[model samples]
Target: QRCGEQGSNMECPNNLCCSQYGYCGMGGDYCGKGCQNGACWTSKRCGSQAGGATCTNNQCCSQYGYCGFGAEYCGAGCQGGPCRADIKCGSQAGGKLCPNNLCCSQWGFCGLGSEFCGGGCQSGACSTDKPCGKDAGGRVCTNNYCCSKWGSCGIGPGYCGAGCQSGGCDG
Candidate 1:
């Protein structure tokens, strides 16, 4: 969706109010712009007049990408749409949180169809079933054999493959 100069003040149809000109659909959330004392401003800068706008610590802001904390905009709480503070790992969508595989890998869980460096969370759990290995941190592993208790993981479990031939490498 796109926000316009009118922002939140844009006219909305019945059964729905313009949460913000950007996300114009009702029953949906928007982290865009809006009306402020008859003026227009993006949720990130609505100040105290933030109507259907977002704020941080009581001030309209896009702090870490989270939005819609104003009573006029969100009606309290984290009512804004998708806005993630940790985009390096996660995202916010429809007021819901989305943690991808990269986030899990950072927490020491990377395996299965998810690559050692680039994978996503699946079925609410990190797949340990190989096609991979785990490093000493338990984040990197092998397909079958076990490595010397936390050594750089290799391929084919326990197989001293070139990936970890030095016992300090990963395949």
Candidate 2:
């Protein structure tokens, strides 16, 4: 259902969550990071200029109605917060952030998929659940996670098999 309105600015209906696009619903897709009202993981959402949410604490709000710190959050399709004019990561000025809190590949790239976070992670959030191990200050992983050969942390082949270190190591 439609929630936030323009000019007047409104909220969701009690139990529903306000989506980034001003719609109301439930679940992570709706009440996750970019929720505007109702039972949301956050307090605001981002989508429409008039009724969308605003990101704070130097964070960026994406068009999908979520808040974060990275390229996808501050690059193209960004809605609010600290929209980084330059969406690049490097050793000098690349970034300490990435998309979906993804890992920063050694090439200074941002992504959450296996390619960037699984076997090629350098820093930022690597594990599918959290960030740790390798370039992540060698902090080590938890929650049944293992630091794999490459760098990232998680479960499964690349993470639990050979080269696995710390936590639920399969080897």
Q: TM per model?
A: 0.17, 0.33
The C-alpha RMSD in Å for every predicted model, in order, reads: 17.0, 12.0
Segments in model 1 whose C-alpha atoms lie over 4 Å from true places: 1-96, 99-117, 120-171
Estimate, for each residue in 69-132, the C-alpha lDDT of model 2 and write its tens digit. Answer: 6687778887655565534454535334543344666666655557666665665555444445
For candidate 2, list the clashing residue pairs, or say none: 34-65, 45-53, 89-94, 90-94
TM-score of 2: 0.33
Candidate 1, which ten residues in sequence have the lowest lDDT sum? 94-103
lDDT scores in order: 0.35, 0.61
Clashes (backbone N, CA, C under 3 Å), per candidate, total 20, 4
Best of the candidates, lDDT: 2
* RMSD in angstroms between candidate 2 and the native structure over all alpha carbons: 12.0
Off by over 4 Å in 2: 1-16, 19-86, 90-95, 127-171
